[PDB]
Design a protein around this ligand. Structure first.
Ligand SMILES: CCCCCCCCCCCCCCCCCC(=O)OC[C@H](COP(=O)([O-])OCC(O)COP(=O)([O-])OC[C@@H](COC(=O)CCCCCCCCCCCCCCCCC)OC(=O)CCCCCCCCCCCCCCCCC)OC(=O)CCCCCCCCCCCCCCCCC
Ligand code: HEA
Ligand code: HEA
Ligand SMILES: CCCCCCCCCCCCCCCCCC(=O)OC[C@H](COP(=O)([O-])OCC[N+](C)(C)C)OC(=O)CCCCCCCCCCCCCCCCC
Ligand SMILES: CCCCCCCCCCCCCCCCCC(=O)OC[C@H](COP(=O)([O-])OCC[N+](C)(C)C)OC(=O)CCCCCCCCCCCCCCCCC
Ligand SMILES: CCCCCCCCCCCCCCCCCC(=O)OC[C@H](COP(=O)([O-])OCC[N+](C)(C)C)OC(=O)CCCCCCCCCCCCCCCCC
Ligand SMILES: CCCCCCCCCCCCCCCCCC(=O)OC[C@H](COP(=O)(O)OCCN)OC(=O)CCCCCCCCCCCCCCCCC
Ligand SMILES: CCCCCCCCCCCCCCCCCC(=O)OC[C@H](COP(=O)(O)OCCN)OC(=O)CCCCCCCCCCCCCCCCC
Ligand SMILES: [Cu+2]
Ligand SMILES: [Zn+2]
Lengths: 88, 196, 60, 151, 161, 265, 116, 495
C-alpha cells in the first residue's frame, strides 16, 4: 500500500482550514499479539506530521496567504503539504 | 544451506532479549554531555579527560607502592561464628542521634526532589503505556478494574459482604423449605392433604 | 466505536453489544420455532394423531 | 530457519557433526548446538504474526486449499464415504426435509400440536392444518416412496 | 568441551513411535482375516519374525543411552515405571481370577449329575472334586518355580553386596 | 493489530478470497448487501482522533525526543490509543534527564517491558507461539534458596536436640580469610572470595569513560518486576510510599483533561 | 510454629536486610550466556504480597532487578556448565590454562554442542 | 520437494516432543468430536420425525442402533479424553512443573499412534463394512455375541478398537504419573504443584486401576464370539460381564470430568487475577472423588437383580461420593467472588454455564443414586438427560473455556469475542432445549435407545427439534469462526 501523505485543506474565501488524509480500513477480525500497527496514514515516516500540524496550527488559524499553493479542482480549497513545518 | 550465521555473537531471540538501554531510548539524537559535562566543548572534555587520567595513574601508583611496602604493626581479625562465610556487616542504616536524623532528613529531601519523583512519573508512564499497548482489541484492557473499583481489605470484605450474603442464603433456605413442602403436599406437617 | 453493528474488533465488543445480542438471538430462536412449527404442520404424521382420533381417544 | 552448519563445524567438538555428510535431517537428527536458532511451535504463525499477517491468505489457491483440508477435509471425507455406503439414508433425509415423504398424512385433516407442558394434555394441545395445502402448493401426497409397512 | 544441560533426559526422535502401533494393527487385522476366511494371509512364523525384528530396537537404544545418558534421576524414573508395569500385570491377573472364581465361590449349581449323599458311594464328592487336574505334575512345576525364585533372589543379593 | 497488506487486490467486489470465505467462513451475502451493518467502520487508524489528540497536547509535543527514537514508527498507534501521550512522554524523558543530572555517582533508570510481569503459571512467561524446546537448562531458581532455612523445625523433625541452635563457637583465625589488605600498617583480614556473587556490583553498571576519577558517573538499568494482580507497589529504597501516593494524586489530576470527554459505556 | 519464633538479637533493627539495594539477593542459574533467567518467590515476602503459590519471574541476567511486590532487589545471573567432553579422555591430574584457553576461546567465538 | 515432504511427515511421525504430541491429540480430538456431532444430528433427525422418516423400515432399525453405539463410543473415548487429557496434558504438564519433556518420551508417541490406529480401525469397520455393531456403547451380551445382526468381523474389529484405546490411555497415565513425581524443579513440593497437574495425576491413577478389568471383559466377548465359549451365554453370566464393564465404567466418567475441574481452576486463577479459594480443599476433594469412585460401580445395575443389602450399600456409597463434589462447587462459587474476571470474555461466561449446568446434572444424578427411586428411572430418558447435561453441557463448556483461553497463547492471535459469543450462547440454549425435556420425558416413562415413541411424548420431541436446529446453527458458527481465525482479511478499502 502507498497513498498520499496527510495534507491541510485551506479555504481562501473563508480562511477555514483543517487537516485531512487517506485512512484505510478493513473488515474487523482477530488482531495479532506480536504486532504494533505501523504508521498507516503517513507511510514510511516517523510520524512527524502530528508535530508539524501542531506547530502550523497557530499560523494557519491566524491567517495565511494561500496564493502560493495549488488549488483543489475548481473550488476555493487549497492543499498544503505537511512534509515540513509551516512558518511563512 | 541458506544464510548460515557466521560466529556466535549475541542475537536477540526468543530465549534472550537483552537489557534495554533506557538512556539511549530517551536521549535519542540528543547529546548527553550537556547534562553530564555542562558548559564544555568536545576539545575541553577530551583535554580534561586526559589530565584526569594521568592524575589518576599517578595516584594509583602511589597507593599501590604504599600498600605494598608498609610495615605491619597490628593484625585485625574479625570475629565470626563457626561455619559462617563472612562476618556480619558492622554498619547500621538507622539514624541513632538527632544530628544523624537531620542529616538523613536533608538527604531525603534532596533525593525526593531529584531521584524519587522521577521514578514515580516514569513508572506511571510505564503503566499507561502498557495499557495502550494492550488496548485496541489486542488484549483485555477495560474489561475490569479501572479507578472506580471498590477495593476492600480482608476484614472489611468478610464483615460487610460475606456474612450478610450467607445470612440471606440461610433465610432463603428456611423459607424455601417451608414453601416447597406446602406447595407439594398442601399442608405444613401432615404430608398430603385430603389423604391422611 | 469501530467494527460493524453486530461485531467488534478483536477482543472489544461493539457499543451496546448485549441488547443487540439478545435481540438477534431472540430473532434466531423465533425463526427456528417457525421452522419446527412448519415441519410439524406439513411433515410426516400418523393416522392416530388426527383431531378426530385424538379427541375420541381422550374421552375414555 | 537457516542451517547452522558453519558454526557447528567451526565450533568446539566438530567430530559430532560428521554424520551430517550422511543421510540426515539437521532439525531432527543432529546434536543441538549452543548457537542454534530457536525453533518455534507453528513456524507459519510465528513468522506471520510479527508482520501483522495471518498464516493463510484466502486469495492464494494453495493457502485456501490447505486451510480447507485442515478444517473441513476429514469431516467431508467421512461424510462422502458414509453417503456412498448408505445412499438410501440420505435420500430419505432429503425426501423428508423437503416435505416429499408424509407417513400417513391426509388432505384436510387437523393434526395435534403442543410445544411443551409435559405429555399430551387435552387441556394444552391445539390442532393445525397444513399451510402448504392451504396455500395450494400441495394437492396430493406421494405414494411411490418407501413406506415402513409392518410398523 | 561441551555445554551441560539439565539432568532430565531430553529425548530423541524414534521410529518406535509408529512401529509398535503398526505392529498392533497388523496383529489385529491378522486375527480378523483368520476369523473371516479361516486361513492365514501371511505365515504365522513370518509374522512372528517381523514382530521380533521390530522390537530389537529397544535393547540397542537402551545400551547406547545407558552408556551416554544416565544418572540417578533417570534411573529412578525407570524403576518407578517398572513398578507401575508390575502393578498393571498384577491387576490383569486379578481380573482373570475374578473371571475364573465367579462361578466357583457361588456354591449352589445346577449340575447334570447327582451330588447327594446315601444314593451312591461316590456321588457325595461329584461337585466338590475335579479329580483330573494333574495335581502331582502341578506340584512338580511348583517346585521348579520355587527353585527359580530362591536362586534368583540369592544371586541378586549376592551380587548387590 | 492487523496489517492489511495490499489494499488494492482486496477492494474488488468479486474475489477468490471473498468466495472462499463465503464457502468456508468469514464472508457472506450479508456483507455484499449490507456492508454498513457487517463491515461498517471497519478496523483501522482514526485520523480524526489522531488530530484531536495532537491538538489537545501542550508544547510538550515540541520538546520530546520521541520522533528520533526507535519507537517513532508507532507514533500514530500511541497518539490515538494513549490519550495525553506527549505530556506523559515529556514527563518520562524529563525524569530520565533529571536522574542523569543528579549528584549521585550511580544513575539508576527503571526499565519496564513485557518481561516485567510475574505469574504463578510458567507458560505465561514465554513468547507466543512457544519455542519448540523450553526449560532445556533446568527450571526456575527460587530466591528463597538464599534465605536461612528453618533450623529449629528442621532439627525438630529429625528428633535432634537443637537446644543450642543459636549458640555457636566464635571463630577468630587468619586461616578463615582469603581477602587480606594492608591499611596504614594494619593487616586487615576480612572476607573470602566467593565467586560470581561477589562481582554483582560492577557487572551491573556501565561507566562514562569521559567522567573523571574524582567525579565518577555510572549508568545502571534497574529492571522492575511486578505481579499486576497486587494493586499496591513497594519500591523499597527507590521510592517512598508517601512520595508514590503524592505522584499518584498528581498524575491522576494532570491527566484528567485528556480523559474526561470520553465514556466507557 | 515458625511465625512465633523469636529474632536472634537486635541486629535486625539496625543492619541492612538481605535484599537491599546494597545487599541484594544474588542467585545463579545454568544456561547459555545472555539467556534470560527464570527465578521466583514462594510468595509473601511482604505482608501485602500473595503467598498462596510460588510466583515466577523472567529477568535479564547480570542486572539489578527489583520486585516491587515485596520490594526486594535481586541479581539472577547465569553460569554456563562448560565441562570436558566425557568420553574417557578427561584429565586425571591437575591441568593448566593453555588447553582450556583454546577450548574457551572456541566456545566464546563459535559455541559448543549441548549435552542432550 | 521429496526432502520437504519427508521432513514434514517425519516431523509429525517420529516426534517425541510433548508440545507437538499435544497439538496432535487436540486436532484428533476435535475431529472425532465433529464426527460424533454429525452422527448425533442424524440420531436427532430420526427422533424428531414420525413414521421412521429416515430408516423407513422396522427391519432397518439396526442402522439407528449402529448410530447410537458409534455416537456414544466416538464421543466418549475419541473426543473428550484426547482433548481433555491428551491435548492439555502433554502440552502443559511439563511446562507447569518447569521441566523439558515427560519421562519415557517414546511412549508418548506410541500412545498417540495407538489412538490413531484405533480411530482408523473404528472408522473403516463402522463406515466401509456392512452391518456394523448395534448394541449400544455398553456392549452387553448376548446381544453383542449371540445375535443375527452381529456376525461380521466389524464387531470384532470394534472390540479390538476398544482394546487399543485402553492401551493408549494406560500408557499416557503411567507417563503422566512418572513425570509429575520426579521431574519437578528444585523447591517445588509435591502438593504445591499446579492444581491441573494433581487432577491429571489422580485421573492417571484412576485409569491404571480399572482398564485391565475392561480388557478382561472385552476378551471375554471376543472369546464368546469366536471360540464359541459360554462365558456370557445361557450357561454364563451376562451379569458377570456387566460387573466387569462397570467396574471400568464409572472410573471412566470421573476420569473424563476431573481434568475439566483442573483446567477450570487453572484458567480461573489466570483470568480473575486471584488465587483459588481453598486450594488445599479443592485438591483434597479431587483425590477424594477419585478414590471414592472405585466403590460405586454397581449403581448402574440396580435392576439386574442385586442383593438388597448390596443395593443399600451402593446407594450409600453414591451419596458419599456426592459430598466432595458439593465442596468443590462451593469453592468455585467463593473463588469467583471478589475477583476481577473479564466481563466480556467467552471464558468467563463459559465458566458460568459450566458451573450452573454441572450443578443441575449433579442433582439429577443424585436422584438416580437411590436404589429404590432408580426402579422408575433406569433405562429411560432421565438417564440420558443426566449424562448429557453433565458431559455435553459441563465438560464441553470446560473445554470451551480452555479453547477460548489457550488459542491466543498457542497461535498468537486474539479472539473474535462477538463471534464466539454467538457460538457459546447458541450452544447453551440449543443444548438446554434438547436435553432438559428428556428429564420430564423420563419421569413420564419414555424409554431410551428407541427410534419410535408413543404419541404421548410429542411435546418433548418438538422442543428437541427446536434445540437441534439451534445446535446446527451454533456448531456451524463454531467451525466458521475457527476457519476465520487463521485467515487474513478479505476486504479493505479507503475511508
Ligand atoms: C488424500 C489427500 C492426499 C494429499 C493431498 C495434498 C496435501 C493436503 C494437505 C496439505 O496441504 O498438507 C500440507 C500442509 C503444510 O503445508 P503449508 O501449510 O503450506 O506449509 C506449512 C509449513 O510447511 C510448516 O508450518 P506449520 O508447522 O505451522 O504447519 C501448519 C500448521 C497449521 O495448523 C494450524 O493452523 C492448526 C491445526 C492444528 C490445531 C491443533 C491445536 C488444537 C486444536 C485447535 C482447534 C482446531 C481443530 C481443527 C479444526 C476443527 C474445526 C474447528 O500446522 C499444521 O498444518 C499441522 C496440523 C496437524 C495436521 C496433521 C496431523 C497428523 C495427522 C493426525 C490425524 C488426522 C486424522 C486421521 C483420521 C483417520 O500440512 C501439513 O503438512 C500437515 C502435516 C501433514 C502430514 C502429517 C503426518 C503424516 C500422517 C500420516 C498418517 C495419517 C493417518 C493414517 C492414514 C493411513 C496410513 C498412511
Ligand atoms: C462426551 C460424550 C458425549 C457428547 C459430547 C454427546 C453429545 C450429544 N449427544 Fe450423546 N450420548 C453419549 C455421549 C455424548 N453425547 C453416550 C455415552 C450415549 C449413549 C449411547 C447409548 O445410549 O448407547 C449418548 C446417546 C445420545 C442419544 C441417544 C438417543 C437415544 O438413545 O434415544 C441422543 C439423542 O438425543 C444424543 C444426543 C446428543 C446431542 C444432540 C449432542 C450434541 O450435539 C450436543 C452438544 C454438541 C456439541 C457442540 C458437542 C460436540 C462438540 C464439537 C462440535 C467438537 C468441538 C469441540 C469442543 C466444542 C470443545 N446422545
Ligand atoms: C463425566 C460424566 C459424568 C459425571 C460427572 C457423572 C456423575 C454422577 N453420576 Fe453418572 N453417568 C454418566 C456420566 C457421569 N456421571 C454416564 C455417561 C452414564 C450412563 C452410562 C450408561 O448407562 O450409559 C451415567 C449414569 C449414571 C447412573 C445410572 C442411572 C441408571 O443407569 O440407572 C447413576 C445412578 O446412580 C449415576 C449417578 C451419578 C452421581 C450420583 C454423580 C455424582 O458425581 C454427581 C454429584 C454432584 C453433586 C451432587 C453436585 C453438587 C451438589 C451440591 C452443590 C450440594 C448438594 C448436596 C447435598 C444435597 C447433600 N450416573
Ligand atoms: C499377586 C496377584 C495374585 C492374583 C491372583 C488372585 C489373588 C487372590 C485375591 C483376588 C481378589 C480379587 C478377585 C476376586 C473377586 C471377585 C470374586 C467374584 O467373582 O465375586 C462375585 C461372586 C458373587 O457371584 P454371584 O453370586 O453374583 O453369581 C455367581 C455366578 N452365577 C450367577 C452363575 C451364580 O462373589 C462375591 O460377590 C463375593 C464377595 C466379593 C469378594 C470376594 C473375595 C474373594 C476372596 C478369596 C480369598 C482366597 C484367595 C486365595 C485362594
Ligand atoms: C486394555 C488393557 C490395558 C492394560 C494392559 C496391561 C498389560 C501391560 C501393558 C503395558 C503398557 C504400559 C507400559 C508402561 C511403562 C513400562 C516401562 C517403560 O516403558 O519403560 C521405558 C522403556 C522405554 O523408555 P523410553 O525409550 O521412552 O525412554 C526412557 C528413558 N531411558 C530409556 C533412558 C530410560 O520401555 C521399554 O523399553 C519397553 C520395553 C521393550 C519391549 C516391549 C515393548 C512394548 C511397547 C509398548 C506397547 C505394547 C503393546 C502390546
Ligand atoms: C435474557 C436474559 C439474559 C440471558 C443470558 C444469561 C446468561 C446465562 C449464563 C451462561 C452464559 C452463556 C453465554 C452468554 C452470552 C452473553 C449473555 C448476556 O446477555 O450477557 C449480558 C448480560 C446483560 O448485561 P447488561 O445488559 O447489564 O449490560 C449493560 C451494561 N453496560 C453498562 C456495560 C453496557 O449479563 C448480565 O447482565 C449479567 C450480570 C448481571 C449484573 C447486572 C448489572 C447491570 C448493569 C449495570 C447497569 C447500571 C446499574 C443498574 C443497577 C443494578 C440492578 C439490576
Ligand atoms: C481400592 C479399590 C477397591 C475396589 C473394590 C471395592 C469393593 C467394594 C465392595 C463391593 C461389593 O461388595 O460388591 C458386591 C458385588 C457382588 O454383589 P451381588 O452380586 O449383588 O451380590 C453378592 C453376591 N450374591 O461384588 C462384585 O461384583 C465382585 C466383587 C467386588 C469387586 C472385586 C474387585 C477386586 C480388586 C480389583 C482391582 C482393584 C484395583 C484398584
Ligand atoms: C441478514 C442475514 C441474512 C442475509 C441473507 C442470507 C445469507 C447470509 C450469509 C450466508 C453466510 C453466513 C455469513 C458469513 C459468516 O461468517 O457467518 C457467520 C455467522 C455467525 O454470526 P451470525 O449468526 O451472523 O450473528 C448475527 C446474526 N446475523 O453465521 C453463521 O455462522 C451461520 C451458519 C453458516 C451459514 C452459511 C452456510 C453456508 C453458506 C450458505
Ligand atoms: Cu457411575
Ligand atoms: Zn516476593
Amino acid at each position: 500500500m502507498n497513498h498520499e501523505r496527510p495534507w491541510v485543506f485551506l479555504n481562501k474565501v473563508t480562511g477555514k482550514w483543517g487537516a485531512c488524509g487517506w485512512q484505510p480500513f478493513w473488515k474487523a477480525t482477530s488482531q495479532s499479539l506480536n504486532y504494533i500497527p505501523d504508521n498507516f496514514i503517513a507511510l514510511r515516516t516517523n510520524g512527524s506530521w502530528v508535530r508539524n500540524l501542531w506547530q502550523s496550527s497557530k499560523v494557519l488559524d491566524r491567517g495565511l496567504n494561500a496564493s502560493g499553493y495549488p488549488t483543489v479542482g475548481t473550488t476555493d480549497w487549497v492543499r498544503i503539504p505537511l512534509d515540513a513545518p509551516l512558518e511563512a | 544451506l541458506g544464510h548460515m550465521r557466521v560466529g556466535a555473537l549475541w542475537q536477540s531471540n526468543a530465549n534472550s532479549r537483552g537489557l534495554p538501554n533506557l538512556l539511549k531510548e530517551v536521549m535519542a539524537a540528543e547529546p548527553i554531555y550537556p547534562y553530564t559535562h555542562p558548559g564544555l566543548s568536545a576539545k575541553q572534555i577530551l583535554w580534561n579527560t586526559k589530565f584526569n587520567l594521568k592524575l589518576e595513574k599517578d595516584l594509583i601508583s602511589i597507593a599501590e607502592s604504599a600498600v605494598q611496602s608498609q610495615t605491619v604493626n597490628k593484625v585485625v581479625i574479625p570475629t565470626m561464628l563457626t561455619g559462617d562465610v563472612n562476618p556480619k556487616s558492622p554498619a547500621s542504616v538507622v539514624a541513632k542521634d538527632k544530628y544523624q536524623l537531620a542529616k538523613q532528613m536533608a538527604e531525603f529531601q534532596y533525593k525526593k526532589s531529584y531521584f524519587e519523583k522521577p521514578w514515580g512519573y516514569m513508572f506511571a508512564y510505564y503503566c499507561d503505556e502498557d495499557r495502550a499497548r494492550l488496548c485496541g482489541g489486542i488484549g483485555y484492557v477495560g474489561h475490569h478494574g479501572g479507578g472506580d473499583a471498590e477495593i476492600l481489605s480482608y476484614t472489611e470484605y468478610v464483615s460487610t459482604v460475606v456474612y450478610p450474603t450467607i445470612f440471606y442464603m440461610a433465610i432463603t433456605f428456611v423459607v424455601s423449605l417451608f414453601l416447597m413442602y406446602y406447595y407439594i403436599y398442601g399442608t405444613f406437617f401432615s404430608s398430603t392433604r385430603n389423604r391422611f | 466505536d469501530k467494527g460493524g453493528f453486530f461485531f467488534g474488533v478483536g477482543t472489544q465488543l461493539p457499543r451496546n453489544f448485549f441488547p443487540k445480542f439478545l435481540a438477534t438471538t431472540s430473532a434466531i430462536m423465533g425463526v427456528t420455532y417457525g421452522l419446527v412449527w412448519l415441519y410439524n404442520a406439513a411433515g410426516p404424521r400418523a393416522k392416530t394423531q388426527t383431531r378426530k382420533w385424538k379427541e375420541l381417544e381422550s374421552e375414555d | 530457519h537457516g542451517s547452522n552448519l558453519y558454526n557447528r563445524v567451526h565450533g568446539n567438538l566438530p567430530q559430532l557433526y560428521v554424520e551430517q555428510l550422511y543421510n540426515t535431517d539437521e532439525i531432527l537428527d543432529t546434536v543441538p548446538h549452543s548457537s542454534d536458532p530457536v525453533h518455534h511451535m507453528f513456524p507459519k504463525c510465528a513468522a506471520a504474526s510479527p508482520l501483522g499477517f495471518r498464516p493463510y491468505d484466502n486469495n492464494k489457491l494453495w493457502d485456501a486449499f490447505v486451510l480447507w483440508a485442515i478444517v473441513y477435509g476429514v469431516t467431508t471425507i467421512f461424510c462422502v464415504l458414509h453417503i456412498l455406503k448408505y445412499p438410501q439414508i440420505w435420500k430419505h433425509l432429503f425426501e423428508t426435509l423437503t416435505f416429499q415423504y408424509t407417513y400417513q398424512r391426509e388432505i384436510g385433516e387437523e393434526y395435534v400440536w403442543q410445544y411443551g407442558g409435559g405429555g399430551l394434555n387435552p387441556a394444552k394441545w391445539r390442532f393445525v392444518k397444513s399451510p402448504l395445502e392451504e396455500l395450494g402448493l400441495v394437492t396430493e401426497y406421494r405414494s411411490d416412496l418407501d413406506y415402513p409397512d409392518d410398523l | 568441551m561441551i555445554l551441560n544441560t539439565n539432568i532430565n533426559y531430553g529425548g530423541r526422535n524414534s521410529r518406535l513411535c509408529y512401529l509398535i502401533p503398526l505392529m498392533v494393527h497388523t496383529i489385529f487385522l491378522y486375527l480378523a482375516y483368520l476369523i473371516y476366511y479361516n486361513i492365514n494371509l501371511i505365515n504365522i512364523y513370518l509374522l512372528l519374525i517381523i514382530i521380533i525384528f521390530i522390537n530389537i530396537e529397544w535393547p540397542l537404544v537402551i545400551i547406547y543411552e545407558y552408556i551416554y545418558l544416565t544418572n540417578y534421576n533417570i534411573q529412578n524414573n525407570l524403576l518407578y515405571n517398572i513398578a507401575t508395569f508390575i502393578f498393571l500385570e498384577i491387576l490383569l491377573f486379578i481380573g482373570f481370577y475374578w473371571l475364573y472364581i465367579n462361578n466357583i465361590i457361588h456354591y449352589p449349581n445346577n449340575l447334570p449329575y447327582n451330588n447327594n449323599i446315601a444314593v451312591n458311594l461316590l456321588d457325595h464328592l461329584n461337585h466338590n472334586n475335579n479329580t483330573d487336574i494333574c495335581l502331582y505334575i502341578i506340584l512338580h512345576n511348583l517346585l521348579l518355580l520355587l527353585y527359580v525364585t530362591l536362586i534368583l533372589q540369592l544371586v541378586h543379593r549376592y551380587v548387590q553386596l | 493489530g492487523t496489517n492489511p497488506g495490499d489494499i488494492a487486490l482486496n477492494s474488488k467486489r468479486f474475489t477468490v478470497g471473498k468466495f472462499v470465505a463465503w464457502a468456508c467462513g468469514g464472508w457472506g451475502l450479508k456483507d455484499w448487501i449490507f456492508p454498513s451493518l457487517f463491515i461498517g467502520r471497519g478496523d483501522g487508524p482514526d485520523f480524526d482522533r489522531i488530530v484531536k489528540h495532537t491538538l489537545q497536547s501542550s508544547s510538550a509535543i515540541e520538546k520530546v525526543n520521541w520522533f528520533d527514537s526507535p519507537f517513532a514508527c508507532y507514533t500514530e498507534w500511541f497518539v490515538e490509543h494513549f490519550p495525553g501521550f506527549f505530556d506523559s512522554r515529556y514527563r518520562f524523558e524529563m525524569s530520565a534527564k533529571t536522574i542523569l543530572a543528579n549528584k549521585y555517582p550511580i544513575k539508576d533508570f527503571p526499565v519496564v517491558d513485557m518481561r516485567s510481569w510475574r505469574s504463578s503459571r510458567l507458560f505465561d512467561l514465554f513468547e507466543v507461539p512457544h519455542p519448540e524446546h523450553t526449560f532445556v537448562f533446568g527450571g526456575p531458581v527460587l530466591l528463597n534458596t538464599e534465605a536461612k532455612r528453618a533450623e529449629r523445625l528442621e532439627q525438630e523433625w529429625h528428633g535432634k536436640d537443637g537446644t543450642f541452635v543459636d549458640v555457636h563457637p566464635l571463630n577468630v583465625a587468619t586461616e578463615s580469610h582469603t581477602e587480606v589488605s594492608v591499611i596504614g600498617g594494619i593487616k586487615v583480614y576480612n572476607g573470602v572470595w566467593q565467586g560470581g556473587k561477589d562481582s554483582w556490583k560492577r557487572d551491573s553498571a556501565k561507566p562514562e569513560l569521559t567522567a573523571p576519577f574524582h567525579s565518577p558517573i555510572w549508568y545502571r538499568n534497574m529492571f522492575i518486576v511486578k505481579n499486576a494482580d497486587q494493586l499496591v507497589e513497594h519500591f523499597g529504597e527507590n521510592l517512598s510510599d508517601e512520595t508514590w501516593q503524592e505522584v499518584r494524586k498528581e498524575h491522576l489530576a494532570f491527566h484528567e483533561r485528556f480523559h474526561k470527554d470520553y465514556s466507557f459505556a | 510454629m515458625y511465625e512465633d519464633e523469636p529474632y536472634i538479637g537486635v541486629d535486625h533493627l539496625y543492619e541492612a536486610h538481605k535484599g537491599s539495594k546494597e545487599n541484594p539477593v544474588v542467585v545463579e542459574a545454568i544456561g547459555v550466556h545472555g539467556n534470560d533467567v527464570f527465578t521466583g518467590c514462594l510468595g509473601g515476602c511482604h505482608k501485602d504480597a500473595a503467598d498462596a503459590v510460588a510466583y515466577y519471574t523472567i529477568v535479564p541476567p547480570n542486572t539489578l532487578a527489583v520486585c516491587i511486590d515485596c520490594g526486594i532487589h535481586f541479581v539472577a545471573r547465569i553460569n554456563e556448565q562448560l565441562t570436558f567432553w566425557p568420553d574417557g579422555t578427561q584429565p586425571w591430574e591437575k591441568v593448566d590454562f593453555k588447553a582450556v584457553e583454546g577450548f574457551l576461546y572456541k566456545h566464546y567465538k563459535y559455541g559448543s554442542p549441548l549435552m542432550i | 520437494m521429496i526432502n520437504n515432504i519427508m521432513h514434514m511427515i517425519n516431523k509429525y511421525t517420529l516426534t517425541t516432543s510433548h508440545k507437538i504430541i499435544g497439538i496432535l491429540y487436540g486436532y484428533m480430538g476435535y475431529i472425532a468430536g465433529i464426527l460424533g456431532y454429525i452422527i448425533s444430528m442424524l440420531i436427532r433427525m430420526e427422533l424428531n420425525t414420525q413414521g421412521l422418516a429416515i430408516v423407513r423400515k422396522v427391519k432397518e432399525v439396526t442402522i439407528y442402533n449402529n448410530w447410537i453405539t458409534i455416537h456414544g463410543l466416538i464421543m466418549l473415548f475419541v473426543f473428550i479424553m484426547p482433548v481433555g487429557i491428551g491435548f492439555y496434558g502433554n502440552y502443559l504438564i511439563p511446562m507447569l512443573i518447569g521441566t523439558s519433556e515427560l519421562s519415557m518420551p517414546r511412549m508418548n508417541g506410541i500412545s498417540f499412534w495407538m489412538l490413531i490406529v484405533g480411530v482408523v480401525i473404528f472408522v473403516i469397520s463402522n463406515v466401509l463394512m456392512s452391518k456394523p455393531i448395534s448394541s449400544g456403547w455398553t456392549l452387553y451380551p448376548p446381544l453383542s455375541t449371540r445375535d443375527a445382526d452381529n456376525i461380521g468381523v466389524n464387531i470384532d474389529l470394534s472390540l479390538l478398537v476398544v482394546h487399543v484405546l485402553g492401551i493408549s490411555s494406560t500408557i499416557g497415565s503411567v507417563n503422566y504419573i512418572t513425570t509429575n513425581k520426579y521431574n519437578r524443579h528444585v523447591g517445588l513440593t509435591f502438593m504445591n504443584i499446579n492444581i491441573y497437574n494433581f487432577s491429571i495425576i489422580v485421573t492417571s491413577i484412576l485409569l491404571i486401576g480399572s482398564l485391565p478389568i475392561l480388557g478382561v471383559a472385552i476378551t471375554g466377548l471376543l472369546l464368546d464370539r469366536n471360540i464359541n465359549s459360554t462365558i456370557y451365554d445361557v450357561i454364563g453370566d451376562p451379569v458377570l460381564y456387566q460387573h466387569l464393564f462397570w467396574f471400568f465404567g464409572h472410573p471412566e466418567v470421573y476420569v473424563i470430568i476431573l481434568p475439566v475441574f483442573g483446567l477450570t481452576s487453572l484458567i480461573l486463577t489466570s483470568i480473575i487475577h486471584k488465587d483459588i479459594f481453598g486450594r488445599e480443599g479443592m485438591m483434597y476433594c479431587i483425590i477424594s472423588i477419585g478414590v471414592v469412585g472405585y466403590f460405586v460401580w454397581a449403581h448402574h445395575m440396580f435392576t439386574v437383580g442385586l442383593d438388597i443389602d448390596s443395593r443399600s450399600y451402593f446407594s450409600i456409597a453414591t451419596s458419599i461420593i456426592s459430598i466432595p463434589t458439593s465442596v468443590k462447587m462451593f469453592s468455585y462459587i467463593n473463588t469467583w467472588a471478589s475477583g476481577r474476571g473479564f466481563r466480556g470474555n467467552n471464558s468467563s461466561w463459559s465458566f458460568f454455564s459450566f458451573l450452573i449446568c454441572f450443578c443441575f446434572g449433579g442433582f439429577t444424578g443424585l436422584l438416580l443414586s437411590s436404589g429404590s427411586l432408580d426402579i422408575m428411572l433406569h433405562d429411560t430418558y432421565f438417564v440420558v438427560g443426566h449424562f448429557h447435561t453433565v458431559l455435553s453441557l459441563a465438560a464441553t463448556f470446560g473445554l470451551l473455556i480452555a479453547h477460548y483461553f489457550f488459542l491466543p497463547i498457542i497461535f498468537s492471535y486474539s479472539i473474535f469475542e462477538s463471534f464466539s459469543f454467538y457460538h457459546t450462547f447458541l450452544l447453551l440454549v440449543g443444548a438446554l432445549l434438547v436435553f432438559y425435556p428428556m428429564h420430564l420425558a423420563g419421569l413420564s416413562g419414555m424409554a431410551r435407545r428407541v427410534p419410535e415413541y408413543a404419541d404421548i411424548f410429542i411435546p418433548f420431541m418438538t422442543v428437541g427439534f427446536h434445540g437441534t436446529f439451534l445446535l446446527i446453527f451454533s456448531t456451524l458458527t463454531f467451525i466458521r469462526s475457527y476457519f476465520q481465525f487463521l485467515s487474513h482479511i478479505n476486504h479493505s478499502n479507503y475511508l
